[PDB]
Assembly symmetry: D2
Homo-oligomer: 257 residues x 4
């Protein structure tokens, strides 16, 4: 398939409901060879299974909060893979206050810092840290959300991280485009994942979108998985710096009238 | 491949440099079954060859300026294909004055009318005219340009057609999304085609883009072809109402500084 | 005030609820000198009153559908005013089918043509037709709507006109910016006017916006009037090609969740 | 004038070339009553003059890096002013590496943190910290740049801060819009200020924009000053969550072809 022989490092695979999960399936299904990351020694076992399920024996710890691990990650990886062809950044986090209720009520220098550190900075951070072993046709891909461009209830500080993340996509594309590397983001629709547990009335949004999206249905990690494989592949060799909505077209309407 | 067994009607195939040409290759290459259109009886012979080259024997006249032919087109087609799975609208035109030099100098109620009739109206026109035989996973795809969103020298009235075209994409996605139909547009970078002959200093733009695009190179009909196949395919089953830039990332920078 | 001595031609003044009405008040209130247009001989009397109410004795017929009247308009005007300092385009229209119910159900080559002729073409049409007597600090201003950028129920074909109109703003700004002329558009929120009678469930939208706008209220022609004066004024001497939302911030949220 | 009797706190006034300077002039000129901030005890003297020049005797230290001073600021201010009617955030900063040369070359967890802390977080930070004494017609205004939406050479990490800042504008508008408070940003064109010294080839950009802007000229702090007075005033009572370009229309074109 269109990923035959491509070596892709996937982050953010946590459950079988993870967006990163559907992207692994879609990649494996297209010939890709995969490697994975996890956070903390207490997940080391779960990711090892998941990796086995995709014929991979490569699992690496990486707390994107630690310069040390990010650097360790690519040193380790280097001994197994000669070069890297794809990196998937499926990483987000915000203190629980910062994504609950009133925007200003959850705001503090600390929450802001953390949400931006982990959800925004980490993406170009990993990029700089892969630059060395990246290939010439290589493709980076990150996940984002409509909340970066429009005020969504409860999203709050996540909204700002995501705006910064999407700006980094553009600055990455320019920085790495010289070397033939492409950088893109997918803007996904609401999908019930672990991370999604912290968005109160997530159920309200999900229902709303199913009512008003042009396609009148919710998206799935397979749909998102499928678009990602594309962007990671050479079919998308003319596509860099894009932010691609995959949300049954929801961004495009004004719903509920 | 990801288009196995899909039946796709392609318009705007004129030369072997046409965008519609690269999209046919990409589709055929992915298992698609193709049908084509042409304008005027004096091209009837050329399109028949082209169709042969993609294992097709289906060629149909269609001047999108004529309600008659647009209707004839889908009546004819109906006797061969039971249903339609994909339609590609690769059609643009503007009187030569309207895309030369000063915007206001080429402006006249007549030019405006024509450019909008042919380049914009025709897309949803064809859609209404296919609605009857369209399938449930069907996908519509049109071509557009960055000049719809930013003032490009010489583009002029084409700029306005293209803004209207892109708006129709959204209204189409809503109208047809109920029936499971997806509608999308690709925003292509500068490609030396016959239509591109009418843009003076097209050579200036093309050179500029090659200098300043993040990927530092120009796009090709194969790159555009490849993205189109994707959008026409069920890989993009979560993607509707999108306008997808395929231009080495050019929209995303500010060049020449 | 900030319009002292500026001579401004206003179109689209039909009732005392018209957007063009609130812009006249705001302009007069700021020292402006006004002139007005009307359509058909059977409104000649109403506009004459309205003009009196703003200390003006200048009323001119102009069916923007007729090259003749558009030209007559500025010939006439020229004998009274030596030069023009501001033009307000407050003109929209679409056959009733084209803004009712299903998008595709109201679509016909004829409706499309008409809505685009009157709502879109007319703006740059008038501009070319004023170019001769326009001054160096002159400012053009048109009205638009959020339906140009996102699919709104019932808006339909008006959506496409408005996208083309907004593109013309950019091409105008480039064309006339050389001569010091500025061109801008205001994107207004829902306001109960005569034109708004043709949007079924306009009452539904208006209520929705009042519920979900960040400011939690609907806009008024005075609010729109006030922004327009600004754009027409030399306060906005650094502002061209802008599309300025004036809608209690509605474009910026995702409502109803 | 349109700011008669309004009490506005201005930050970021550093030189007579400051953007905040032109906004003070424009505000004073329209009837406003002003108060100012400064950073560090070694500027205490300069701001005191500047404040005298606008008939103000209110100057307050505020390192937006310190929770302490931000809180002190509004406690102090409270004893002089009963309530606040306008706040201007004219604050930006990034380590010199982060805005020099290659994006990835200037990237470090620390630079990112700092640029986001000072340029992005500080705006809603100040807002929460003013909420108590803010009035019902109150208006917040921040400064931003086109680099938030498109990759500009050298801007780099500033690009991301600015994207986050502009997202905060939307989330602010929603949070404070309930209480009648409006929140807006101005996207300014290149202006030779102290902060602008750190952008290498700033002179290249400034020249480029003067060549290609629709108005064919650069903007000035008076032009920006004038737009800001507007947004701070009740003329803009229908305008919240907007990001208003003031850049001779530069965002709207594609230059250099
Ligand atoms: N759920 C949705 O609807 C949705 C929509 C759009 C985007 N997203 C985005 O997609 C991404 C994935 O979220 P998800 O929905 O698949 O939920 P998920 O929980 O399955 O994925 C989140 C991942 O973030 C990882 N992560 C958190 N902190 C980390 C750290 N300090 N270092 C490294 N990794 C860390 C978690 O381990 C987890 O694997 C996120 O970036 C999120 O913003 C989710
Ligand atoms: N080269 C560029 O960078 C570029 C970018 C974006 C979109 N396009 C678009 O793609 C399409 C074609 O591009 P192209 O470069 O191959 O131009 P092309 O001239 O080489 O081919 C386009 C085809 O549209 C045809 N056409 C004209 N009138 C028609 C009608 N009434 N009915 C059906 N077809 C008609 C033309 O004759 C031509 O065959 C157009 O829609 C154009 O707007 C070109
Ligand atoms: N209410 C809304 O929310 C809203 C929002 C944005 C823009 N508008 C726009 O502002 C303008 C008018 O709004 P309105 O609410 O006052 O509608 P209105 O009907 O109350 O007044 C608009 C005027 O345009 C006039 N017009 C029609 N054909 C004309 C022609 N050939 N030449 C000159 N004028 C003509 C109408 O007759 C009417 O007098 C239109 O451009 C419309 O698109 C309305
Ligand atoms: N120069 C331009 O072309 C331009 C264009 C668009 C936006 N801007 C933006 O406008 C704002 C003002 O910049 P400027 O161009 O007027 O230059 P400026 O130097 O005159 O203003 C910058 C201000 O930021 C202040 N500041 C820096 N660190 C601070 C801190 N730790 N705490 C509080 N205040 C601090 C400085 O004291 C200074 O007063 C910035 O936010 C900038 O991003 C500048
Ligand atoms: C609103 C649903 C969309 C969405 C859901 C979950 C998301 O994942 C999060 C959310 C907050 C913090 C960390 C990760 C997300 O980015 C986007
Ligand atoms: C730089 C030229 C970009 C471009 C070239 C050809 C294009 O196709 C045309 C051109 C003119 C009229 C109608 C359709 C186009 O849309 C855009
Ligand atoms: C919710 C309605 C918004 C709206 C109302 C009236 C408007 O003015 C019209 C309406 C229909 C046709 C032509 C011009 C408008 O543009 C937008
Ligand atoms: C490129 C010119 C536009 C611009 C110039 C100076 C600016 O001010 C800065 C820049 C970097 C760090 C801190 C403040 C700015 O935001 C935007």
């Amino acid at each position: 398939g269109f990923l035959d022989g491509k070596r892709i490092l996937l982050t953010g695979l946590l459950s079988n409901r993870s967006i990163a999960y559907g992207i692994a399936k879609a990649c494996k299904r297209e010939g890709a060879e995969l490697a994975f990351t996890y956070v903390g020694d207490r997940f080391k076992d779960r990711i090892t299974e998941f990796a086995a399920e995709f014929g991979s024996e490569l699992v690496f710890p990486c707390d994107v909060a630690d310069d040390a691990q990010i650097d360790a990650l690519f040193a380790s990886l280097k001994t197994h893979w000669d070069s890297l062809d794809g990196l998937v950044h499926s990483i987000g986090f915000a203190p629980r206050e910062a994504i609950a209720g009133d925007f200003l009520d959850g705001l503090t220098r600390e929450n802001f810092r953390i949400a931006h550190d982990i959800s925004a900075y980490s993406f170009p951070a990993l990029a700089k840290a892969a630059l060395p072993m990246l290939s010439d046709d290589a493709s980076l891909l990150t996940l984002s959300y409509l909340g970066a461009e429009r005020a969504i209830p409860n999203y709050n500080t996540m909204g700002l991280a995501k705006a910064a993340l999407e700006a980094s996509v553009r600055y990455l594309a320019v920085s790495l485009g010289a070397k033939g590397v492409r950088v893109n983001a997918i803007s996904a629709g609401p999908i019930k994942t672990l991370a999604a547990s912290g968005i109160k009335s997530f159920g309200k949004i999900l229902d709303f979108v199913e009512s008003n999206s042009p396609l009148k249905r919710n998206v799935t990690i397979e749909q998102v998985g499928n678009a990602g494989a594309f962007l990671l592949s050479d079919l998308a060799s003319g596509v860099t710096a894009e932010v691609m909505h995959v949300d049954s077209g929801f961004n495009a309407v004004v719903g509920g009238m």
